[PDB]
XYZ file of N, CA and C in Angstrom:
585
model
N 2.097 37.942 -17.327
C 1.630 36.941 -16.363
C 1.519 35.543 -16.984
N 2.215 34.555 -16.393
C 2.118 33.169 -16.871
C 0.743 32.564 -16.598
N 0.415 31.496 -17.317
C -0.781 30.717 -17.030
C -0.704 30.074 -15.639
N -1.805 30.146 -14.903
C -1.893 29.519 -13.589
C -2.888 28.370 -13.659
N -2.717 27.395 -12.785
C -3.564 26.217 -12.828
C -3.727 25.642 -11.418
N -4.892 25.064 -11.124
C -5.122 24.379 -9.846
C -5.284 22.879 -10.064
N -4.433 22.086 -9.428
C -4.545 20.643 -9.557
C -5.322 20.037 -8.382
N -6.367 19.289 -8.710
C -7.188 18.614 -7.725
C -6.917 17.124 -7.912
N -6.683 16.409 -6.813
C -6.304 14.994 -6.884
C -6.559 14.322 -5.546
N -6.547 12.992 -5.561
C -6.628 12.190 -4.352
C -5.251 11.624 -4.012
N -4.843 11.800 -2.755
C -3.527 11.371 -2.296
C -3.515 9.870 -1.973
N -3.558 9.020 -2.995
C -3.764 7.574 -2.803
C -2.627 6.742 -2.171
N -1.402 7.254 -2.207
C -0.237 6.536 -1.794
C 0.940 7.449 -2.004
N 1.990 7.353 -1.211
C 3.110 8.291 -1.317
C 3.624 8.255 -2.778
N 3.626 7.089 -3.421
C 4.126 6.979 -4.796
C 3.302 7.771 -5.795
N 1.984 7.771 -5.621
C 1.106 8.542 -6.496
C 1.161 10.040 -6.174
N 1.260 10.378 -4.896
C 1.527 11.759 -4.530
C 2.780 12.255 -5.265
N 3.821 11.426 -5.332
C 5.027 11.855 -6.031
C 4.800 12.031 -7.538
N 4.022 11.133 -8.143
C 3.595 11.325 -9.530
C 2.982 12.725 -9.701
N 2.095 13.080 -8.771
C 1.383 14.351 -8.811
C 2.346 15.526 -8.677
N 3.274 15.433 -7.733
C 4.256 16.490 -7.549
C 5.155 16.622 -8.782
N 5.569 15.493 -9.353
C 6.403 15.527 -10.560
C 5.663 16.149 -11.745
N 4.368 15.866 -11.855
C 3.557 16.473 -12.894
C 3.508 17.983 -12.704
N 3.193 18.410 -11.484
C 3.191 19.834 -11.177
C 4.514 20.491 -11.592
N 5.622 19.810 -11.344
C 6.921 20.394 -11.625
C 7.183 20.401 -13.123
N 6.743 19.352 -13.807
C 6.788 19.319 -15.262
C 6.066 20.526 -15.869
N 4.851 20.789 -15.386
C 4.068 21.950 -15.814
C 4.862 23.253 -15.670
N 5.510 23.427 -14.521
C 6.324 24.616 -14.285
C 7.610 24.667 -15.134
N 8.411 23.606 -15.106
C 9.715 23.617 -15.783
C 9.616 23.410 -17.300
N 8.612 22.663 -17.750
C 8.431 22.427 -19.181
C 7.491 23.438 -19.847
N 6.464 23.900 -19.122
C 5.446 24.784 -19.697
C 5.364 26.176 -19.056
N 6.263 26.471 -18.129
C 6.222 27.744 -17.425
C 4.872 28.045 -16.780
N 4.111 26.993 -16.470
C 2.825 27.141 -15.781
C 2.974 27.159 -14.252
N 2.392 28.166 -13.607
C 2.302 28.198 -12.147
C 1.201 27.265 -11.673
N 1.487 26.496 -10.629
C 0.526 25.517 -10.141
C 0.160 25.756 -8.688
N -1.139 25.833 -8.416
C -1.630 25.775 -7.046
C -1.784 24.305 -6.708
N -1.024 23.863 -5.723
C -1.041 22.468 -5.344
C -0.997 22.437 -3.835
N -1.893 21.654 -3.238
C -2.014 21.597 -1.786
C -0.724 21.143 -1.073
N 0.071 20.295 -1.728
C 1.353 19.881 -1.158
C 2.174 21.118 -0.822
N 2.119 22.101 -1.719
C 2.906 23.324 -1.609
C 2.316 24.401 -0.695
N 1.169 24.146 -0.073
C 0.556 25.173 0.775
C -0.009 24.619 2.079
N 0.723 23.702 2.701
C 0.241 23.045 3.910
C -0.023 24.054 5.038
N 0.797 25.103 5.117
C 0.634 26.117 6.160
C -0.650 26.919 6.004
N -0.884 27.415 4.792
C -2.104 28.154 4.496
C -3.322 27.277 4.797
N -3.288 26.039 4.322
C -4.362 25.099 4.624
C -4.505 24.919 6.137
N -3.381 24.897 6.848
C -3.400 24.770 8.307
C -4.178 25.896 8.981
N -3.795 27.136 8.697
C -4.361 28.276 9.403
C -5.785 28.590 8.966
N -5.973 28.899 7.686
C -7.319 28.983 7.125
C -7.928 27.585 7.123
N -9.241 27.483 6.975
C -9.848 26.166 6.890
C -9.393 25.388 5.662
N -9.691 24.092 5.628
C -9.581 23.321 4.387
C -10.671 23.764 3.416
N -11.852 24.053 3.951
C -12.920 24.558 3.112
C -12.566 25.962 2.621
N -12.037 26.784 3.517
C -11.620 28.128 3.141
C -10.557 28.091 2.039
N -9.596 27.181 2.150
C -8.537 27.127 1.151
C -9.082 26.689 -0.213
N -9.783 25.563 -0.238
C -10.384 25.061 -1.467
C -11.271 26.124 -2.133
N -12.118 26.770 -1.339
C -12.960 27.828 -1.867
C -12.154 28.982 -2.447
N -11.019 29.273 -1.823
C -10.136 30.340 -2.281
C -9.449 29.974 -3.604
N -9.041 28.714 -3.750
C -8.400 28.271 -4.987
C -9.365 28.368 -6.166
N -10.562 27.800 -6.007
C -11.555 27.815 -7.075
C -11.848 29.255 -7.506
N -12.091 30.117 -6.528
C -12.376 31.526 -6.772
C -11.293 32.182 -7.623
N -10.031 31.914 -7.293
C -8.917 32.548 -7.999
C -8.827 32.071 -9.435
N -9.114 30.791 -9.654
C -9.079 30.242 -11.002
C -10.216 30.818 -11.846
N -11.454 30.686 -11.371
C -12.588 31.120 -12.170
C -12.482 32.596 -12.553
N -12.056 33.434 -11.610
C -12.055 34.874 -11.868
C -10.876 35.319 -12.738
N -9.819 34.504 -12.773
C -8.681 34.762 -13.654
C -8.764 33.970 -14.958
N -9.896 33.307 -15.184
C -10.098 32.472 -16.370
C -9.070 31.346 -16.475
N -8.583 30.876 -15.329
C -7.591 29.800 -15.293
C -8.245 28.429 -15.134
N -7.504 27.383 -15.486
C -8.053 26.031 -15.516
C -7.917 25.291 -14.190
N -8.839 24.373 -13.953
C -8.738 23.488 -12.811
C -8.568 22.080 -13.340
N -7.407 21.509 -13.083
C -7.120 20.163 -13.545
C -7.616 19.174 -12.506
N -8.548 18.311 -12.899
C -8.983 17.237 -12.020
C -8.222 15.941 -12.323
N -7.280 15.585 -11.457
C -6.556 14.331 -11.616
C -7.332 13.186 -10.987
N -7.768 12.256 -11.829
C -8.573 11.126 -11.382
C -7.766 9.831 -11.199
N -8.156 9.057 -10.191
C -7.452 7.842 -9.814
C -8.310 6.929 -8.947
N -7.707 5.830 -8.512
C -8.401 4.854 -7.691
C -9.116 5.550 -6.539
N -8.433 6.494 -5.900
C -8.997 7.243 -4.790
C -10.126 8.214 -5.161
N -10.072 8.853 -6.329
C -11.189 9.736 -6.699
C -12.476 8.919 -6.917
N -12.353 7.758 -7.557
C -13.486 6.847 -7.680
C -14.090 6.485 -6.318
N -13.253 6.046 -5.374
C -13.764 5.593 -4.078
C -14.329 6.764 -3.283
N -13.671 7.917 -3.335
C -14.178 9.081 -2.596
C -15.517 9.610 -3.145
N -15.711 9.466 -4.452
C -16.940 9.901 -5.094
C -18.063 8.957 -4.674
N -17.798 7.651 -4.728
C -18.768 6.646 -4.307
C -19.177 6.857 -2.864
N -18.250 7.352 -2.056
C -18.523 7.577 -0.647
C -19.415 8.799 -0.516
N -19.117 9.814 -1.320
C -19.905 11.034 -1.326
C -21.366 10.699 -1.690
N -21.534 9.749 -2.611
C -22.836 9.263 -3.066
C -23.477 8.271 -2.086
N -22.813 8.035 -0.953
C -23.276 7.053 0.005
C -23.429 5.659 -0.576
N -22.702 5.360 -1.648
C -22.761 4.023 -2.238
C -21.462 3.240 -2.064
N -20.595 3.762 -1.214
C -19.349 3.105 -0.882
C -18.954 3.610 0.487
N -18.236 2.791 1.251
C -17.818 3.192 2.591
C -16.948 4.448 2.550
N -17.020 5.261 3.617
C -16.108 6.406 3.690
C -14.665 5.916 3.604
N -13.801 6.802 3.133
C -12.408 6.487 2.941
C -11.596 7.309 3.936
N -10.592 6.686 4.531
C -9.714 7.382 5.451
C -8.285 7.019 5.050
N -7.750 7.742 4.071
C -6.433 7.440 3.518
C -5.274 7.950 4.374
N -4.261 7.109 4.529
C -3.073 7.499 5.273
C -2.529 8.875 4.843
N -2.526 9.173 3.539
C -1.967 10.446 3.074
C -2.898 11.644 3.306
N -4.146 11.367 3.673
C -5.078 12.401 4.111
C -5.043 12.460 5.635
N -8.573 15.260 3.887
C -9.144 14.997 2.581
C -9.613 16.191 1.750
N -8.723 16.665 0.919
C -8.946 17.794 0.100
C -9.611 17.452 -1.200
N -9.607 16.210 -1.598
C -10.294 15.890 -2.793
C -11.774 15.941 -2.589
N -12.218 15.358 -1.510
C -13.623 15.424 -1.139
C -14.075 16.877 -0.915
N -13.244 17.665 -0.246
C -13.550 19.078 -0.032
C -13.687 19.811 -1.368
N -12.791 19.497 -2.301
C -12.757 20.161 -3.594
C -13.970 19.739 -4.424
N -14.364 18.468 -4.300
C -15.561 17.955 -4.985
C -16.833 18.652 -4.516
N -16.966 18.817 -3.206
C -18.053 19.627 -2.654
C -18.040 21.012 -3.300
N -16.865 21.634 -3.340
C -16.760 23.006 -3.821
C -17.164 23.155 -5.293
N -16.673 22.268 -6.157
C -16.881 22.436 -7.598
C -18.214 21.858 -8.089
N -18.787 20.975 -7.283
C -20.010 20.253 -7.620
C -21.098 21.056 -8.373
N -21.592 22.162 -7.785
C -22.680 22.890 -8.457
C -22.346 23.338 -9.886
N -21.060 23.415 -10.218
C -20.633 23.953 -11.512
C -21.027 23.049 -12.672
N -21.359 21.801 -12.363
C -21.605 20.821 -13.414
C -23.061 20.734 -13.849
N -23.860 21.657 -13.337
C -25.181 21.907 -13.890
C -25.137 23.245 -14.641
N -23.931 23.810 -14.725
C -23.684 25.066 -15.436
C -22.770 24.848 -16.651
N -23.372 24.614 -17.820
C -22.609 24.441 -19.062
C -21.517 25.505 -19.237
N -21.817 26.754 -18.880
C -20.839 27.838 -18.969
C -19.543 27.545 -18.198
N -19.625 26.669 -17.191
C -18.496 26.378 -16.306
C -17.611 25.187 -16.701
N -18.028 24.394 -17.691
C -17.295 23.165 -18.034
C -15.879 23.418 -18.554
N -15.679 24.537 -19.242
C -14.389 24.844 -19.835
C -13.308 25.169 -18.821
N -13.719 25.334 -17.571
C -12.782 25.578 -16.489
C -12.059 24.286 -16.126
N -12.759 23.170 -16.265
C -12.271 21.894 -15.757
C -11.611 21.042 -16.825
N -10.448 20.494 -16.477
C -9.696 19.606 -17.363
C -9.547 18.243 -16.709
N -10.358 17.306 -17.178
C -10.514 16.035 -16.495
C -9.539 14.991 -17.062
N -8.575 14.611 -16.219
C -7.500 13.706 -16.595
C -7.334 12.526 -15.645
N -6.540 11.563 -16.111
C -6.038 10.466 -15.297
C -4.818 9.868 -16.036
N -3.799 9.447 -15.293
C -2.620 8.845 -15.919
C -2.883 7.403 -16.287
N -2.910 7.119 -17.582
C -3.317 5.802 -18.066
C -2.410 4.669 -17.567
N -1.154 4.991 -17.270
C -0.206 3.978 -16.798
C -0.595 3.392 -15.419
N -1.146 4.229 -14.545
C -1.415 3.841 -13.163
C -2.910 3.934 -12.798
N -3.726 4.427 -13.732
C -5.146 4.708 -13.479
C -6.002 4.439 -14.711
N -7.320 4.546 -14.567
C -8.192 4.180 -15.690
C -9.426 5.052 -15.813
N -10.082 4.956 -16.965
C -11.226 5.809 -17.269
C -12.298 5.620 -16.210
N -12.442 4.388 -15.755
C -13.413 4.084 -14.732
C -13.139 4.817 -13.436
N -11.983 5.482 -13.326
C -11.656 6.229 -12.102
C -12.260 7.626 -12.063
N -12.705 8.107 -13.223
C -13.340 9.418 -13.324
C -14.777 9.391 -12.766
N -15.061 10.243 -11.767
C -16.428 10.332 -11.237
C -17.396 10.780 -12.331
N -18.571 10.169 -12.360
C -19.607 10.535 -13.326
C -20.174 11.942 -13.090
N -19.740 12.594 -12.014
C -20.022 14.009 -11.815
C -19.603 14.795 -13.054
N -18.554 14.324 -13.725
C -18.006 15.036 -14.872
C -18.710 14.635 -16.157
N -19.356 13.474 -16.119
C -20.271 13.040 -17.159
C -19.742 13.374 -18.544
N -20.423 14.282 -19.239
C -20.088 14.588 -20.630
C -18.873 15.483 -20.912
N -18.013 15.647 -19.908
C -16.850 16.501 -20.057
C -15.822 15.545 -20.641
N -14.986 16.041 -21.531
C -13.889 15.268 -22.087
C -12.853 14.838 -21.052
N -12.303 13.666 -21.281
C -11.411 13.004 -20.367
C -10.119 12.923 -21.092
N -9.026 13.191 -20.427
C -7.748 13.106 -21.082
C -6.857 12.065 -20.456
N -6.649 10.958 -21.131
C -5.644 9.989 -20.683
C -4.275 10.654 -20.829
N -3.557 10.806 -19.718
C -2.197 11.353 -19.695
C -1.161 10.215 -19.607
N -0.051 10.322 -20.333
C 0.293 11.499 -21.118
C -0.053 11.429 -22.618
N -0.610 10.310 -23.089
C -1.081 10.205 -24.484
C -1.732 11.482 -25.000
N -2.562 12.112 -24.181
C -3.314 13.269 -24.664
C -2.930 14.554 -23.948
N -1.706 14.632 -23.429
C -1.304 15.855 -22.744
C -1.301 17.072 -23.667
N -1.061 16.834 -24.951
C -1.118 17.889 -25.955
C -2.420 18.684 -25.837
N -3.539 17.970 -25.736
C -4.845 18.614 -25.674
C -5.036 19.397 -24.374
N -4.523 18.843 -23.286
C -4.575 19.512 -21.997
C -3.778 20.796 -22.086
N -2.618 20.705 -22.709
C -1.787 21.885 -22.928
C -2.552 22.983 -23.650
N -3.254 22.618 -24.718
C -4.021 23.600 -25.478
C -4.999 24.318 -24.545
N -5.647 23.567 -23.657
C -6.670 24.165 -22.807
C -6.067 25.098 -21.763
N -4.977 24.662 -21.132
C -4.213 25.516 -20.220
C -3.742 26.799 -20.899
N -3.475 26.708 -22.196
C -2.877 27.809 -22.928
C -3.893 28.637 -23.704
N -5.138 28.170 -23.723
C -6.202 28.847 -24.454
C -5.840 28.936 -25.929
N -5.875 27.796 -26.612
C -5.475 27.742 -28.013
C -6.528 27.121 -28.923
N -7.062 27.930 -29.836
C -7.894 27.437 -30.931
C -9.374 27.416 -30.578
N 5.201 9.667 -26.717
C 6.085 9.910 -25.579
C 7.080 11.038 -25.861
N 6.577 12.160 -26.372
C 7.419 13.298 -26.753
C 7.838 14.173 -25.575
N 7.088 14.084 -24.492
C 7.348 14.898 -23.319
C 8.649 14.487 -22.635
N 9.143 13.303 -22.987
C 10.305 12.739 -22.327
C 11.546 13.584 -22.559
N 11.532 14.383 -23.622
C 12.676 15.241 -23.943
C 12.531 16.667 -23.399
N 11.362 16.972 -22.833
C 11.148 18.244 -22.142
C 11.628 18.177 -20.684
N 12.115 19.311 -20.143
C 12.599 19.352 -18.755
C 11.546 18.838 -17.784
N 11.911 17.861 -16.956
C 10.986 17.309 -15.980
C 10.152 16.136 -16.483
N 10.229 15.852 -17.780
C 9.458 14.764 -18.356
C 9.911 13.390 -17.892
N 11.219 13.149 -17.948
C 11.804 11.880 -17.497
C 11.556 11.616 -16.002
N 11.598 12.669 -15.189
C 11.293 12.540 -13.767
C 9.833 12.095 -13.563
N 8.906 12.713 -14.292
C 7.485 12.351 -14.187
C 7.309 10.909 -14.623
N 8.004 10.543 -15.699
C 7.893 9.196 -16.236
C 8.505 8.174 -15.282
N 9.602 8.540 -14.632
C 10.199 7.635 -13.653
C 9.212 7.416 -12.492
N 8.590 8.503 -12.031
C 7.542 8.438 -11.000
C 6.356 7.549 -11.414
N 5.889 7.715 -12.647
C 4.823 6.860 -13.171
C 5.243 5.380 -13.183
N 6.388 5.096 -13.797
C 6.899 3.732 -13.854
C 7.000 3.128 -12.459
N 7.496 3.918 -11.512
C 7.743 3.398 -10.175
C 6.447 3.013 -9.438
N 5.402 3.829 -9.583
C 4.091 3.546 -8.991
C 3.471 2.344 -9.686
N 3.529 2.343 -11.017
C 3.036 1.207 -11.782
C 3.626 -0.130 -11.307
N 4.957 -0.224 -11.248
C 5.609 -1.452 -10.796
C 5.093 -1.856 -9.412
N 4.835 -0.870 -8.561
C 4.377 -1.171 -7.205
C 2.975 -1.792 -7.179
N 2.038 -1.209 -7.928
C 0.690 -1.770 -8.077
C 0.752 -3.219 -8.536
N 1.782 -3.547 -9.310
C 1.999 -4.922 -9.735
C 2.559 -5.735 -8.565
N 3.594 -5.211 -7.908
C 4.182 -5.881 -6.747
C 3.170 -6.041 -5.618
N 2.361 -5.007 -5.388
C 1.373 -5.037 -4.312
C -0.006 -4.608 -4.798
N -0.762 -5.557 -5.378
C -2.104 -5.335 -5.945
C -3.168 -4.816 -4.955
N -2.922 -4.946 -3.656
C -3.864 -4.441 -2.661
C -3.357 -3.144 -2.026
N -2.423 -2.492 -2.715
C -1.858 -1.239 -2.234
C -2.962 -0.266 -1.751
N -4.049 -0.121 -2.511
C -5.061 0.875 -2.139
C -5.737 0.537 -0.806
N -6.220 -0.697 -0.698
C -6.850 -1.189 0.523
C -5.934 -1.080 1.752
N -4.625 -1.113 1.542
C -3.702 -0.965 2.661
C -3.587 0.484 3.104
N -3.852 1.398 2.172
C -3.845 2.838 2.445
C -5.095 3.307 3.194
N -6.122 2.466 3.183
C -7.412 2.824 3.752
C -7.512 2.449 5.237
N -7.477 3.457 6.107
C -7.593 3.241 7.554
C -9.056 3.134 8.007
N -9.269 2.528 9.171
C -10.612 2.176 9.637
C -11.604 1.947 8.498
């Protein structure tokens, strides 16, 4: 049985969604890791609840000793602030499973035994440390891809080089493309936010 993983993220813009999908594919084609990703299960999410689906993903990871990757970004920051009632609610065009997933995993962060399940990341090219919700507090943060090595170790239970691995250049092209856009359109996030 290959390593399985659940990716949690905020769908901030079609370009960042593509970054996320390319990462998922990199994990599969470069690391032989199976990924639970909401993009890939729209039907299941449709029929079962969104809460039912999120609850089902977490359950499968924890009981199989598999990791939950938290991908942090501009949207995870804003959605967390909203959850805290210290920022307006967010209504993103691409949406909200990140908020649902945050509700689901929340209690785990008063449980030290549960921290090793979570792998807290953000892509340094398009996102920043300040994007990580303080819910994760003292959990290690991995700037990707600078520190993907460490994330790999955790996914594998152990103890720009990825560009030559299958799917690495595609992920990097996706990163570059979103980055250039944030430069071209600095208010990209605010444009994604409806009402």
